[PDB]
């Protein structure tokens, strides 16, 4: 587990954020404002993701 750790962070210069990790930081009023299609588009079902 020192190999799989060191293969991944060696020359990483770009960091990706999923759809889920950028919803839990948005407040309750920013998500409904119409400048955000993309977070609000996949808010389809209550129970699923």
Which chain residues interact with other proteins by CB under 8 A? 1-10, 12-13, 15-17, 21-22, 24-27, 29-30
Residue 12 or 37: the one with the smaller Cβ distance to other proteins is: 12
d(CA 31, CA 43): 10
DSSP state of 8: H
- The residues, ordered by sequence, that sit 6+ positions from 26 with a Cβ below 8 Å of its Cβ are 36, 39
Work out how close the CB of 27 gets to other proteins at its nearest, in angstroms, rounded to a whole number: 6
Work out how close the CB of 44 gets to other proteins at its nearest, in angstroms, rounded to a whole number: 11
Work out how close the CB of 6 gets to other proteins at its nearest, in angstroms, rounded to a whole number: 5
d(CA 37, CA 31): 9
């Amino acid at each position: 587990l020192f190999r799989t750790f060191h293969q991944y962070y060696m020359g990483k210069n770009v960091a990706f954020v999923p759809d889920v990790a950028q919803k839990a930081l948005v407040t309750t009023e920013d998500l409904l404002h119409p400048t955000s299609h993309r977070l609000l588009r996949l808010e389809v079902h209550p129970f699923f993701d």
